UniProtKB/Swiss-Prot annotation:
It comes from Homo sapiens (Human). This is Steroid 17-alpha-hydroxylase/17,20 lyase. It comes from the Eukaryota. Heme binds at C409. The gene is CYP17A1. Pathway: Steroid hormone biosynthesis; Steroid biosynthesis; glucocorticoid biosynthesis. Changing R463H: In AH5; 30% 17alpha-hydroxylase activity and 29% 17,20-lyase activity. A cytochrome P450 monooxygenase involved in corticoid and androgen biosynthesis. Catalyzes 17-alpha hydroxylation of C21 steroids, which is common for both pathways. A second oxidative step, required only for androgen synthesis, involves an acyl-carbon cleavage. The 17-alpha hydroxy intermediates, as part of adrenal glucocorticoids biosynthesis pathway, are precursors of cortisol. It is an enzyme of class 1 (oxidoreductase).
Length: 471
């Protein structure tokens, strides 16, 4: 006969305890695969089942193609310009399309995507080779390689080794990622509006520096540019721009700031995602020597040492394809994609969703659904193979590492080639070992905009059999 306390507020688990994406997924046992939390005025819906997710992303994909406002995203996107963090509409549709259309200047020519990639991988391998017998962090050499790839695709410039501008990019990259969100993007409680903090101030200084740096390349490129040379991304965007004076409906959408941010998004997305996945891949091979050995045998049997690996090679290095697929399952780069938002009054699984409501797909939930996968916690590349190991299969519909629909990733083709190639070249040539202290990388992860792995070292060695075939 004692009374319930008045309740001003309720949350279903602790903030800043454990990973968000896993917290949400544990909740699916009591509350089912779809539920909502209310923050002040803002309502957020979380979706943990492939069918409900495919509804959000494909079937009613335009209804949910929105992105919410966040004070952090604002600053990194110079107030919702660019692609990723721009809302649905005029500006987004064009720049998305333009960047997608650029991926075609590399279908097959002097600058075939596979060539640009390989030349930068050749360099990575030569730099790696001098560290023969040593334990190292590979984060930066890889970062360089994929920075040059993304540079070549953007500007047709790359950097010489030792170019200081690389270390500057690295610094502001680490900064922006660090301050963009504490953990995940999805912030149950908005602490940054509650307690005095320096977070937005920090982030403006890093982005100011990124902006300064891309502004230099932009002005200076105005000289090189010619309307009868479309070889790279800035040319796609400037060609579209002077295609906006007739007697101009697309000129407002392509100011220098709009162009800045778009390149920024591609420059960033291009570097940080794939470096993380490479780091994640080595980490998994270090914990799984049996898979590593079977990767050596496969590359030996099928490529051998007579030449260097090729895009065509994905048709015979099947276990390598399956490993990548399984790193993308088990540690998805974006475990909750990026937040969607209802453009209009709509529904999911026939529940009402109001215009402007935040919608998150829990990719991690999909990728660990125990009804959809055998032993979802486990690193099992075999799961993407038929039992005899002679062909790739799709064991589950509950698999969307690159998302789906209108907000899907535009960099999948680039990402996929890059990752297979980097891993292929690295295996052909290097023994990759636990460094001389028995320290194995933690596989827990660090959720930010990208799902990162704690930094770690590998003992790098030139392969017996690679030196053999050098006589
Ligand atoms: C391992 C590599 C990658 C993975 C797993 C990945 C996955 C994703 C996912 C899951 C999304 C968001 C889907 C959503 O919000 O519903 C996304 C968005 C995006 N990705 Fe990637 N991505 C990768 C690499 C790349 C690369 C290399 C690029 C560079 C060209 C890139 C460019 C973008 C852009 C611009 C968006 C925003 C799309 C939009 O809002 O319209 N991504 N990606
Ligand atoms: C913050 C950062 C990376 C560091 C840079 O200094 C600033 C920057 C620019 C745009 C961001 C990018 C990281 C990844 C983002 C968010 C991204 N993106 C593209 N594919 C992704 C897959 C998973 C997570 C993010 C993904 C699209 C635009 C990208």
């Amino acid at each position: 006969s004692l009374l319930s306390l008045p309740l001003v507020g309720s949350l279903p688990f602790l903030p800043r305890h454990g990973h968000m994406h896993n917290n949400f997924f544990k909740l699916q046992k009591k509350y089912g695969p779809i539920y909502s939390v209310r923050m002040g005025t803002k309502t957020t819906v979380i979706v943990g089942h492939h069918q409900l997710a495919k509804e959000v992303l494909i079937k009613k994909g335009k209804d949910f193609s929105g992105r919410p406002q966040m004070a952090t995203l604002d600053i990194a996107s110079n107030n919702r310009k660019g692609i990723a963090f721009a809302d649905s509409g005029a500006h987004w549709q064009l720049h998305r399309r333009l960047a997608m259309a650029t991926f075609a200047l590399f279908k097959d020519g002097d600058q075939k995507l596979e060539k640009i990639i390989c030349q930068e991988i050749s360099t990575l391998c030569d730099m790696l080779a001098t560290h023969n017998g040593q334990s190292i962090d590979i984060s930066f050499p890889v970062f360089v390689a994929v920075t040059n790839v993304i540079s070549l695709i953007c500007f047709n410039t790359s950097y010489k080794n030792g170019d200081p501008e690389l270390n500057v990019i690295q610094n502001y990259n680490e900064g922006i990622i660090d301050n963009l969100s504490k953990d995940s993007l999805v912030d149950l409680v908005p602490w940054l509006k509650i307690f005095p903090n320096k977070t937005l101030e920090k982030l403006k200084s890093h982005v100011k520096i990124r902006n300064d740096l891309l502004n230099k390349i932009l002005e200076n490129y105005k000289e090189k540019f010619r309307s009868d040379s479309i070889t790279n991304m800035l040319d796609t965007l400037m060609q579209a721009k002077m295609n906006s004076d007739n007697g101009d409906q697309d000129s407002e959408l392509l100011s220098d700031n709009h162009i800045l941010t778009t390149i920024g998004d591609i420059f960033g997305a291009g570097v940080e995602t794939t470096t993380s996945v490479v780091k994640w891949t080595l980490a998994f091979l270090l914990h799984n020597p049996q898979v590593k050995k079977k990767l050596y045998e496969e590359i030996d049997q099928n490529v051998g040492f007579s030449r260097t690996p090729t895009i065509s090679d994905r048709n015979r290095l099947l276990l390598l394809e399956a490993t990548i697929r399984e790193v993308l399952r088990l540690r998805p780069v974006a475990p909750m994609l990026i937040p969607h938002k209802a453009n209009v009054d709509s529904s999911i699984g026939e529940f009402a969703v109001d215009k402007g409501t935040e919608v998150i797909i829990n990719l991690w939930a999909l990728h660990h659904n125990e009804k959809e996968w055998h032993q979802p916690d486990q690193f099992m590349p075999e799961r993407f193979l038929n039992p005899a190991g002679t062909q790739l299969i799709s064991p589950s519909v509950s698999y969307l590492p690159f998302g789906a629909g209108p907000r899907s990733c535009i960099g999948e083709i680039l990402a996929r080639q890059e990752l297979f190639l980097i891993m292929a070249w690295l295996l052909q040539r290097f023994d990759l070992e636990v460094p001389d202290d028995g320290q194995l990388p933690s596989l827990e992860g660090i959720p930010k905009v990208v799902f990162l792995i704690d930094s770690f070292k590998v003992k790098i060695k030139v392969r017996q059999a690679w030196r053999e075939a050098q006589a």
